[PDB]
């Protein structure tokens, strides 16, 4: 994989024009099966039937393309996200064998993309305290960070002692 991996989020979202069919994938990907597409919150499937989509650009640094079979209506929300599973993509012999820079590039590029997908979810889709806040720097102190399971009609509420977050029932 002799491409360079740019610093681009592994998620993009669009509001469709009237009758739009083509949407750009700005982040790199290696397999068509590892790119998820939603339209108004409903995941689509690859194919040529109405309601499906085609995809191109695997292995490219960027500039992939999603082509809807059915043209989108105005203000349809199209979401495109990378979802490559984590695993080894190489195998090296213990006995004396050959090595190429393409082998190393393929391993490191795919591992960088996997890390970017984790960090994209962390940065865009998850909650965190502001980095400058005075949380405990010892992770064993779980007062601010561990959550309980919520029962029916319950919210997360710090208890009156200020020692941990507990599930709290709320009524009118």
């Amino acid at each position: 994989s002799n491409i360079k991996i740019n610093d681009v989020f592994q998620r993009i979202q669009y509001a469709a024009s009237a009758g739009q069919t083509q949407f750009t994938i700005p982040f790199p990907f290696f397999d068509n099966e590892y790119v998820l597409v939603w339209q108004n919150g409903v995941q689509l499937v690859m194919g040529g039937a109405p309601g499906q989509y085609g995809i191109s650009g695997a292995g490219s640094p960027s500039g992939g393309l999603i082509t809807l079979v059915t043209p989108a209506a105005l203000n349809d929300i199209i979401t495109i996200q990378g979802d490559m599973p984590i695993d080894r993509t190489s195998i090296y012999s213990a006995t004396i064998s050959n090595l190429t820079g393409s082998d190393l590039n393929g391993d490191f590029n795919r591992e960088v993309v996997m890390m970017k997908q984790i960090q994209t979810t962390q940065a865009l889709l998850q909650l965190q305290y502001a980095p400058w806040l005075e949380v405990s720097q010892d992770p064993d102190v779980t007062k601010d960070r561990y959550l309980p399971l919520l029962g029916s009609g319950q919210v997360w509420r710090m208890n009156d002692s200020g020692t941990g977050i507990e599930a709290y029932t709320i009524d009118e």
């Binding site: 491409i3 360079k4 490219s60 640094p61 500039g63 050959n98 090595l99 190429t100």
Partner: protein, 817 residues
């Protein structure tokens, strides 16, 4: 039915019109393409030698004015001490309206010798005659000069060559002088100092130093008082004082440039060809008599006294056949060979000829017109370019035929031959080849590897990032004169090599190179007519600015989008600073090398090895599409002197040292180019762009490196030939199951069926220590190319980055259907 076949490359690149000639024994010994490689006499193919940058050709007497006209430069070699390996590369270059000689030794400019005797427009017509210890400078209209080295490398003198006695010729014999056959000559006496009187005007001032022969006597004229009176000194006594004109012989000096001294003479000119042969100096092809050569007195190179007609005296040879026989080259092979405008003149080497006045038997051998490029001697044969410059001719003596036989040495490789403009020879140390080199008008260089007794004759084509203009060399070494482009920053000189207009699908190709190159008032073309149209531009060298003049600007902003094509064939967007504001006003579009970081040469629709950029209109509505008058780019032409070397794998190389940040300076001659860096251990560490100031950054810091440009070798074997019992399978469907690449001392190889090739590894995991450079590798690599079933399919052996490369053969397992 699987068949195992193999292919060697002894015969070089073969013309496509030979591809049905399975009867010849060359079908498995040649290549469809042999580019930037040579054929060794063992049959292997080796990457062509690289070059080392020496100097840039400038007018040193006019503030280092850059020379941009290849006709203003002409070089030649001069070996001064073969055992000490002292060979001088002398460059004749423009110096104002005159010439100068730049003398190079050890890749360094030693001294410059100027001369006002020659014009800058006469440079390409200056020939030399190299002796054991001096060089004669020859021009048909300028008296001979001597260039002789003094007591050091930097001490040189250019003087005039003055004969002891001039040669003589009777120009009335060819109708170029007054006919005196009806005149009567009267002598005052038969001996001593006399006066010769003519009944009619015959004498000119050029008759001073001439001869008068009649009645068995000879007299040398010493003064010409008028057209009818002259004073002469008797050399052999006359038998009488009355001489009939038709029985006499009056000859003037053969060489003369004086046409003003009374009585006025004709411009007879001076010899333009010459060679030193044994103990005589041979000079010929003067301005007035181009089909005549003169041999000096035996043992006295500067004496051409031809008063006597016997012995070791100086004499002349005239070449006549059917038509013009003007001498082109005088070759010191066997007994002297004379290539002319029509016929080759020589005598049989089986004849015991002592080379004297009445013991020379030069005869018209085969018909073989030749041009003014000097003939080459190598590998037991003589090679010379034909008169139309589209062929190289080989001359050898055939005892079975009793004469010299001339035949085209380019007979099997006519397709790659363009018009040839120079040639040289090279016998490099340690390399299994004898080389004949020849540059062409299109900027390429032919390479001919020959070993004729072993039936080795292989042609190949050499290309560079630039244009070869001359090749210099007589066997010991080889230099080239190359025209290259450099980035000149904010100024604009050159035009794009290619320019097309394309449709939204990027499939249409409408060539508009001429419109962009022409001035706005000669040609113009409308561009970006519709939304999503393209402008595709390409150039041999990288460029970082465009300068556009519009005959008609766009009515509104075209919303331009810019992309460049990288080495993987991927188009990538970049954002330049365009001062045209979407082709709405005349101006420049500029970008930095960081915007085009991945830019690399690539192929677009059969146009190979260009730096491509495409411009796409995004605006939906423009009322008036722009019309472009001219486009210029920020590159300019330069002319360089470079030395070819088999230890180099890049072009125009230079040894540099990087600092702690990897910064490298002093690469001004490579400004704007893409260069590779090779370590002293022999590892290519990558490529980078030199900016306009001659600086670049490399990966290795605090390292001594070699930096140069890539020339990409390409080897395409002959079509698969697997004759079965059914007959020749020349047109049968074939599929290559296995492809074997057999290589020696090679790195960075790749092979297979395009577009998806296979890289050949050169690192042994489990037996490699980090930081070391693996040596060049030897072995056999087996590949499944995954090609098609066509009878004439192409497989490629090439190199990903510069390095050593030698392919000794290609094998196949072919399913012949």
């Amino acid at each position: 039915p699987i068949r195992s076949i193999s292919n060697t490359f002894n015969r070089g690149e073969l013309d496509p019109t030979l591809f049905a000639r399975d009867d010849l024994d060359i079908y498995d010994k040649g290549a469809r393409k042999l580019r930037n490689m040579i054929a060794l006499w063992t049959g292997a193919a080796r990457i062509a030698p690289g070059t080392i940058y020496i100097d840039m050709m400038v007018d040193r007497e006019n503030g280092n004015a850059v020379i941009q006209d290849p006709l203003m430069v002409k070089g030649f070699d001069f070996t001064y001490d073969a055992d000490a390996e002292i060979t001088y590369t002398i460059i004749i270059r423009k110096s104002g309206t005159n010439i100068a000689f730049d003398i190079y030794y050890a890749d360094t400019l030693q001294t410059t010798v100027t001369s006002t005797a020659y014009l800058a427009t006469q440079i390409q017509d200056i020939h030399v005659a190299a002796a054991h210890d001096r060089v004669l400078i020859l021009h048909e209209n300028v008296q001979i000069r001597q260039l002789k080295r003094g007591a050091s490398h930097s001490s040189w003198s250019l003087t005039t060559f003055n004969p002891r006695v001039y040669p003589t010729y009777d120009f009335s014999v060819i109708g170029e002088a007054i006919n005196y056959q009806s005149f009567t000559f009267t002598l005052s006496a038969t001996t001593g100092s006399i006066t010769i009187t003519s009944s009619s005007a015959v004498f000119t001032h050029n008759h001073v130093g001439g001869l008068f022969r009649s009645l068995g006597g000879t007299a040398r004229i010493t003064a010409v008082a008028s057209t009818t009176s002259a004073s002469a000194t008797v050399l052999d006594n006359f038998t009488g004082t009355s001489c009939a004109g038709n029985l006499s012989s009056l000859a003037e000096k053969l060489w003369n440039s004086d046409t003003t001294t009374a009585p006025v003479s004709a411009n007879r000119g001076w010899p333009a060809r010459g060679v030193f042969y044994l103990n005589r100096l041979i000079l010929g092809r003067s301005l007035a008599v181009k089909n005549l050569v003169n041999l000096s007195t035996a043992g006295v190179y500067d004496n051409f006294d031809d008063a006597d007609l016997d012995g070791l005296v100086a004499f002349s040879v005239t070449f006549n056949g059917k038509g013009e026989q003007s001498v082109q080259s005088i070759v010191a092979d066997d007994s002297i060979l004379f290539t002319t405008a029509n016929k080759l003149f020589a005598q049989s080497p089986l004849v015991e000829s002592p080379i004297t006045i009445n013991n020379v038997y030069f005869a018209p051998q085969s018909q073989s017109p030749a041009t003014s490029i000097e003939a080459a001697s190598i590998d037991n044969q003589t090679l010379f370019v034909s008169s139309d410059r589209t062929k190289v001719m080989q001359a050898m003596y055939s005892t079975a035929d009793g004469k010299y036989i001339t035949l085209p040495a380019t007979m099997l490789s006519n397709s790659i031959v363009d018009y040839i403009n120079s040639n040289g020879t090279w016998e490099p140390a340690g390399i299994s080849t004898r080389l004949y080199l020849a540059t062409q008008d299109n900027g390429t260089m032919l390479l001919y590897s020959t070993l004729q007794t072993q039936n080795v004759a292989g042609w190949s084509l050499r290309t560079t990032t630039g244009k070869f203009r001359q090749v210099i060399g007589e066997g010991r070494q080889s230099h080239v004169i190359v025209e290259r482009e450099i980035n000149i920053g904010a100024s604009f000189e050159q035009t794009l090599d290619y320019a097309y207009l394309s449709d939204p699908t990027f499939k249409a190709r409408y060539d508009v190179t001429e419109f962009f190159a022409s001035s706005p008032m000669t040609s113009a073309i409308g561009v970006l007519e519709n939304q999503n149209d393209y402008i595709l531009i390409g150039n041999q060298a990288p460029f970082t600015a465009l300068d556009i003049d519009f005959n008609l600007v766009a009515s509104s902003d075209c919303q331009l989008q810019f992309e460049y094509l990288d080495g993987n064939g991927f188009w990538d967007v970049f954002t330049p600073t365009d001062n045209t504001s979407g082709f709405t006003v005349d101006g420049t579009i500029t970008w930095t090398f960081d915007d085009v970081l991945n830019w690399a040469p690539y192929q677009v629709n059969a146009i190979e090895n260009q730096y491509w950029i495409r411009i796409k209109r995004l605006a939906e509505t423009v009322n008036t599409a722009p019309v472009i008058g001219q486009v210029l780019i920020n590159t300019g032409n330069r002319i360089y002197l470079e030395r070819q070397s088999f230890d180099e794998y890049m072009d125009s190389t230079q040894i540099v040292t990087s600092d702690s940040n990897g910064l490298v300076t002093g690469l001004t001659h490579l400004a704007g180019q893409q260069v590779y860096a090779i370590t002293e251990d022999g590892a290519t560490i990558g490529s980078s762009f030199v900016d306009a100031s001659g600086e670049t950054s490399v990966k290795n810091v605090n390292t001594t490196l070699t930096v140069g440009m890539q020339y990409k070798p390409e080897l395409i074997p002959m079509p698969l030939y697997a004759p079965t019992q059914m007959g020749d399978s020349l047109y049968a469907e074939k599929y290559v199951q296995d492809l074997y690449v057999d290589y020696v001392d090679s790195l960075y190889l790749q092979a297979g069926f395009r577009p998806q090739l296979t890289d050949i590894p050169n690192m042994h995991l489990g037996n490699y220590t980090l930081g070391q450079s693996v040596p060049p590798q030897t072995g056999i690599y087996r590949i499944c190319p995954r090609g098609d079933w066509e009878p004439r399919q192409e497989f490629v052996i090439t190199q990903s980055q510069p390095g050593p490369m030698t392919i000794i053969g290609v094998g196949y397992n072919v399913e012949v259907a």
